[PDB]
Amino acid sequence: VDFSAHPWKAPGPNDSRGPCPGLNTLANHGFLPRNGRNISVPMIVKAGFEGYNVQSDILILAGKIGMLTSREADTISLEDLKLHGTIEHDASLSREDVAIGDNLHFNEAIFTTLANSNPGADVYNISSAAQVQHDRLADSLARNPNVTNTDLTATIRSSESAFFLTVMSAGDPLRGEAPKKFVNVFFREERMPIKEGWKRSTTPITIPLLGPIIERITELSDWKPTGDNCGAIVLSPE
Amino acid sequence: AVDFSAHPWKAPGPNDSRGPCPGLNTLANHGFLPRNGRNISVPMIVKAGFEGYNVQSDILILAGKIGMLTSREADTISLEDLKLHGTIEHDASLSREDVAIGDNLHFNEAIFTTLANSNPGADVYNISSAAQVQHDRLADSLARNPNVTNTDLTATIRSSESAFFLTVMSAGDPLRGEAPKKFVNVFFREERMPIKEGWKRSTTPITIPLLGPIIERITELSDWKPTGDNCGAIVLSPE
Ligand code: HEM
Numbered sequence A: 001v002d003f004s005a006h007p008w009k010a011p012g013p014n015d016s017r018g019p020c021p022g023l024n025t026l027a028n029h030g031f032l033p034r035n036g037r038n039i040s041v042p043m044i045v046k047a048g049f050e051g052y053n054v055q056s057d058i059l060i061l062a063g064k065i066g067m068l069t070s071r072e073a074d075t076i077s078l079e080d081l082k083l084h085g086t087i088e089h090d091a092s093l094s095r096e097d098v099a100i101g102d103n104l105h106f107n108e109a110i111f112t113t114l115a116n117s118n119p120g121a122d123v124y125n126i127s128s129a130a131q132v133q134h135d136r137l138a139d140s141l142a143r144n145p146n147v148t149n150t151d152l153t154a155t156i157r158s159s160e161s162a163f164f165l166t167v168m169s170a171g172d173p174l175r176g177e178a179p180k181k182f183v184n185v186f187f188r189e190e191r192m193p194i195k196e197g198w199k200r201s202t203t204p205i206t207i208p209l210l211g212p213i214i215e216r217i218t219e220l221s222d223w224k225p226t227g228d229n230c231g232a233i234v235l236s237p238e
Numbered sequence B: 001a002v003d004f005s006a007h008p009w010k011a012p013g014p015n016d017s018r019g020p021c022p023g024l025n026t027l028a029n030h031g032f033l034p035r036n037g038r039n040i041s042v043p044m045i046v047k048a049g050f051e052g053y054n055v056q057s058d059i060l061i062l063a064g065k066i067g068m069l070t071s072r073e074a075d076t077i078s079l080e081d082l083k084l085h086g087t088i089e090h091d092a093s094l095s096r097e098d099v100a101i102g103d104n105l106h107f108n109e110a111i112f113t114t115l116a117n118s119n120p121g122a123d124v125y126n127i128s129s130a131a132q133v134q135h136d137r138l139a140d141s142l143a144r145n146p147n148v149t150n151t152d153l154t155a156t157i158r159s160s161e162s163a164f165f166l167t168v169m170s171a172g173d174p175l176r177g178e179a180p181k182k183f184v185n186v187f188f189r190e191e192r193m194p195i196k197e198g199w200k201r202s203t204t205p206i207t208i209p210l211l212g213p214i215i216e217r218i219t220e221l222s223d224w225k226p227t228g229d230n231c232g233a234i235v236l237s238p239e
């Protein structure tokens, strides 16, 4: 992996970007196509390995679910992933709920909750991620009459916290903690925080590595389901 | 541009991967998909279904990407992978047994007795008879399968599959919502395009807008109602 051959570039109007900081950051570095188009599961598997040392087990599983969001046979544009109720969910860390705002773009007012978490410490961790999930869900339950909160959205949310905690770690992703200086750049700029001192994990990030972090965040989050608790996903756009 | 003479039916070998879907198994039996049933991608399905049946990309991209969930591979399946229960594969099939009480993969003539003897007095199967068969097959599963799953999603998939055989095996106008029995029976029993019987590829493209009203008509005629867990949750991956 030569990271100097993968410089960050800001997206312009030819560049599709979605609700996922992980994939948007890979596109901003050219590990995925910079235009955010014509993205296949094999391209995601390779880009996640090269950029983040994320292994194929999770990227095939998630990637094939994400492909459902487009109208194309075996590719997406990253913006397609905003399709509500496939993967995209309410009570995001950095986006608004679709019923009451913009479910696509980074939103600093939403991000405030994560940004102010684990106060006095230099890291986010499992405990602070759980508290943020609790507080984000409580915000959606208070303000969004159309909130969807189910076993499946709760699991996806904890997967996403585990992703930022592992991929943006100081080098040992097992530990379930990540420097704030790295995670904040990842979200706010969709940039690998290389200038700040981040490096790609030398440990493969796999389903067995993520699973305990996901389950422990859920356990500490004081979570309950809402409504019919139906794990049905949206299988296609329009 | 399709040359059917270059696509002869050959009986599948015991080692050729085949699934629960007569549409894709027939395409493989004619070499529109690989005859071994392996290494099949959505683009391959789109091309095969266009060439073989005049089924357009909208419906094959939608179905195909859901089918891709049934394998552990990045962008392909084997046909047999599509037997994964609760992705697309469902109870109350027209020609297969429910997985909890039998074989959910192979054509079963005993199960097929219901469809084969439907629309009595006509030489076609139609929207009304397909609806009645869906009612009767679901009633069988509700009676005999203690693990039966019947949701708005499974009911819609079942109507879609009836609409597929009525349109693709039609006597040439798929809008009619009827297909000759002599064609449909070969399609199911042999997973063969009934070319010597007089079947020809539709000259009307079969699309989501074409199918939608047929599917809705089959559903309403089938007298379907929710019975239990009505959550349209699918199985998103093998274990
Ligand atoms: C490659 C490693 C990946 C990392 C590090 C990553 C990270 C993240 C994070 C941290 C979020 C939460 C954003 C928020 O709550 O505001 C998220 C959201 C999302 N990710 Fe990813 N992700 C990755 C891969 C994937 C893949 C493969 C897909 C699908 C192909 C995907 C689809 C999504 C979608 C649709 C959302 C929006 C969910 C929501 O917040 O409503 N991600 N991702």
Ligand code: HEM
Pocket (backbone or CB within 6 Å): B020, B021, B022, B023, B024, B045, B049, B053, B055, B060, B063, B064, B065, B066, B067, B068, B082, B083, B088, B089, B090, B091, B092, B093, B094, B095, B096, B161, B162, B164, B165, B168
């Ligand atoms: C190409 C045109 C297609 C036609 C004409 C067709 C036709 C059918 C029909 C008539 C059945 C019902 C069998 C029964 O109930 O015994 C069926 C089942 C099935 N089809 Fe297809 N199909 C096509 C394409 C597809 C595609 C693209 C996929 C997925 C990639 C697929 C996956 C399935 C599966 C999994 C089943 C089993 C459902 C069940 O009966 O439990 N089909 N198909």
Ligand SMILES: [Mg+2]
Pocket (backbone or CB within 6 Å): A019, A088, A089, A090, A091, A092, A095, A096, A097, A103
């Ligand atoms: Mg969201």
Ligand SMILES: [Mg+2]
Pocket (backbone or CB within 6 Å): B020, B089, B090, B091, B092, B093, B096, B097, B098, B104
């Ligand atoms: Mg079945």
